[PDB]
A paper describes a structure:
To mitigate the low fidelity of RdRp, all coronaviruses encode a 3′-to-5′ exoribonuclease ([name]) in multifunctional [name] (10–12), which forms a complex with [name] critical for the [name] activity, and additionally contains a C-terminal guanine N7 methyl transferase (N7-MTase) domain. The multifunctional [name]-[name]-2 [name] consists of the N-terminal [name] domain involved in proofreading and the C-terminal N7-MTase domain that functions in mRNA capping. Collectively, these results show that the N-terminal [name] domain of [name]-[name]-2 [name] is sufficient for binding to [name] to form an active exonuclease complex that preferentially degrades dsRNA.
We obtained crystals under two different conditions, one containing ammonium tartrate and the other containing magnesium chloride (MgCl2), albeit in the same crystal form. The structures were determined by molecular replacement phasing and refined to 1.64- and 2.10-Å resolution for the tartrate and magnesium-bound crystals, respectively. The final models consist of [name] residues Asn3 to Arg289 (Val287 for the lower-resolution structure) and [name] residues Ala1 to Cys130, with two zinc ions bound to each polypeptide chain. While our structures of [name]-[name]-2 [name]–[name] obtained in the two different crystallization conditions are highly similar, they show notable differences in the exonuclease active site located around the “knuckles” of [name]. In the crystal grown in the presence of MgCl2, we observed a magnesium ion octahedrally coordinated by Asp90, Glu92, Asp273, and three water molecules. The previously reported [name]-[name] [name]–[name] structures also showed only one metal ion, bound at an alternative site between Asp90 and Glu191 (21, 26). This site is unoccupied in our structure, presumably due to the E191Q mutation. A comparison between the [name]+-bound and free structures shows a significant rearrangement for residues Gly265 to Val269 including the main chain atoms, accompanying an inward movement of His268 upon [name]+ binding.
Residue numbers in the entry:
A (entry chain A): 3 to 287
B (entry chain M): 1 to 130
Write the structure that this text describes.
C-alpha cells in the first residue's frame, strides 16, 4: 500500500519524469510498464515545477545502535518529570498552489509561550527541495477564528527555531539535562519538530561535559542548555504521547477530570499546559 | 487531497534520515544496524546494451548493471533535505544512474558510498580501470 508521508500536494495532474521522480509511485503513468519504468526519448523532463511535499506521517521507531530513542516509556518520562515541557501546535491548511497538508502556524509550550511562524513548507524543485513560504489559509471553524490574524503576524522559521532553543534553554538549564515534550496526538507535533529538531548520536557540549541538547548549523557545534546562545536547533529531544495512555475523548475532557484551573482550549500554549497538567495528574496520583 | 509518493516500508528510514544532522552517516548506520535498504526506487526497463557509464542522460546500463532514475537513488532527494553541495544542486536528479546488479538491492546506499571516476565516467571499483 502507500503512506501519507512525503505526499505530493501539488495540483499538477501529470506525474514526474523518471529522472526527477523521487519514487516509482511519483513517476508519470506514461512511463510505467511491467512494474518498471521506461525512458521515452521525446518527452522532456520538467524544469519549472514546484511541488509541495507533505511532512505529515513521520515514524520514529528506528532502532540504530548509538542513536537514542525520541519517544520514551511512561516510566522513563516519570523519572525525568523535571524535563517535561508541554507542546502543541495549531496549524494552517495549504491552499492555492497546493492542497493536502498542514503547516505549523502557532507553536505553544507549557511555559505559556506562543510563537507564530510564517506558513512554510518543503517544496520539491527540479534541482532540490526548497524550504520556503507557501500559500496557506486558516482552518474553518469558530474555535479557529483567533488564527486568522496570525496568518499575517508570523516570524521566519530561522528566527522561530532560535527562540525555541532560547526558551527551552532558559527554562531547563537549572532543571534537567534534557527535554521531554509532553504531547497529545503526536502526529502534527512531530511534523512541526521537523522545522526545529535534529537527531543523531549522543554528543557532549563543546564547552563542558554535559550532554548536548542543542545544535548550531552555522558552526556545526553542539551545546547544552547553558551554552546554547545563538543555537538554532534542538538536538536529541525526548517526547511521549499522553493520548496513547488509554484515554477516551479529547484533551480538555480528560484534563477536566483532574483539574479545573486550566481552560481556553485550541490555543497552542493552553493545550500544551493542559497536556502537561494531565500527564502529571495521571502519573503521580 | 494529494498523491502519495512513498510506501510504509520506507517510513522508518526516511523519518530517521529526515531528522538527522548527518543524514549520510544516519543511513549508513541504519544499514549497519540491520535496517532494510530504501525501496520504491525508479527501476528502468532497458535493453542493457548501454555504454555502462555511471551517470547519463539516458539509461546506459550494460549486462552487469541496472538503470535507475537519478532522483530515486539520492538519499537527499528521498528525504527532501539539503544536499551537501554548497549551491544545493544534485548530481543525480535529472539523470539516470547505472548501478551494478549485485548492488541493485540498495541503489541509494551505492551512490552514497561510491564515487564516479572523473576520467572514464564509471564507478571506481565497478567499471573504472584507470
Ligand atoms: Cl540518554
Ligand atoms: Mg491544540
Ligand atoms: Zn555546556
Ligand atoms: Zn490543569
Ligand atoms: Zn538529490
Ligand atoms: Zn576511470
Amino acid at each position: 500500500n502507500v503512506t501519507g508521508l512525503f505526499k505530493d500536494c501539488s495540483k499538477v495532474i501529470t506525474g514526474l519524469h523518471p529522472t526527477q521522480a523521487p519514487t516509482h509511485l511519483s513517476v508519470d503513468t506514461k512511463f510505467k510498464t511491467e512494474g518498471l519504468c521506461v525512458d521515452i526519448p521525446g518527452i522532456p523532463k520538467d524544469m519549472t515545477y514546484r511541488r509541495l511535499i507533505s511532512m505529515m506521517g513521520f515514524k520514529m521507531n528506528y532502532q540504530v545502535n548509538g542513536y537514542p530513542n525520541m519517544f520514551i516509556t511512561r516510566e522513563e518520562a516519570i523519572r525525568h518529570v523535571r524535563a517535561w515541557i508541554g507542546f502543541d501546535v495549531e496549524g494552517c491548511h495549504a491552499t492555492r498552489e497546493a492542497v493536502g497538508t498542514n503547516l505549523p502556524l502557532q507553536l505553544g509550550f507549557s511555559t505559556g509561550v506562543n510563537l507564530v511562524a510564517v506558513p512554510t513548507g518543503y517544496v520539491d524543485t527540479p534541482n532540490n527541495t526548497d524550504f520556503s513560504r507557501v500559500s496557506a489559509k486558516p482552518p474553518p471553524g469558530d474555535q479557529f477564528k483567533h488564527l486568522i490574524p496570525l496568518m499575517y503576524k508570523g516570524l521566519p522559521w530561522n528566527v522561530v527555531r532560535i527562540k525555541i532553543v532560547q526558551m527551552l534553554s532558559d527554562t531547563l538549564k537549572n532543571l534537567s539535562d534534557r527535554v521531554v515534550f509532553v504531547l497529545w496526538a503526536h502526529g502534527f507535533q512531530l511534523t512541526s519538530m521537523k522545522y526545529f529538531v535534529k537527531i543523531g548520536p549522543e554528543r557532549t557540549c563543546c564547552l563542558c561535559d554535559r550532554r548536548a541538547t542543542c545544535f548550531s548549523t552555522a558552526s556545526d557545534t553542539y551545546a547544552c542548555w547553558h551554552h546554547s546562545i545563538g543555537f538554532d536547533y534542538v538536538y536529541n529531544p525526548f517526547m511521549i504521547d499522553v493520548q496513547q495512555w488509554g484515554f477516551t475523548g479529547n484533551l480538555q475532557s480528560n484534563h477536566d477530570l483532574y483539574c479545573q484551573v486550566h481552560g481556553n482550549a485550541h490555543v497552542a500554549s493552553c493545550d500544551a499546559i493542559m497536556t502537561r497538567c494531565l500527564a502529571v495528574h495521571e502519573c503521580f496520583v | 487531497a494529494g498523491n502519495a509518493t512513498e510506501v510504509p516500508a520506507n517510513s522508518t528510514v526516511l523519518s530517521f534520515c529526515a531528522f538527522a544532522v548527518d543524514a549520510a552517516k544516519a543511513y549508513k548506520d541504519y544499514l549497519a544496524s540491520g535496517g532494510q535498504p530504501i525501496t520504491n526506487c525508479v527501476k528502468m526497463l532497458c535493453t542493457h546494451t548501454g555504454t555502462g557509464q555511471a551517470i547519463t542522460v539516458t539509461p546506459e546500463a550494460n549486462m552487469d548493471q541496472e538503470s535507475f532514475g537519478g532522483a530515486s537513488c539520492c538519499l537527499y532527494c528521498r528525504c527532501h533535505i539539503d544536499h551537501p553541495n554548497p549551491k544545493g544542486f544534485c548530481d543525480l536528479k535529472g539523470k539516470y544512474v547505472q548501478i551494478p546488479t549485485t548492488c541493485a538491492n540498495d541503489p541509494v546506499g551505492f551512490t552514497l558510498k561510491n564515487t564516479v571516476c572523473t576520467v572514464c565516467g564509471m564507478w571506481k571499483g565497478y567499471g573504472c580501470s584507470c
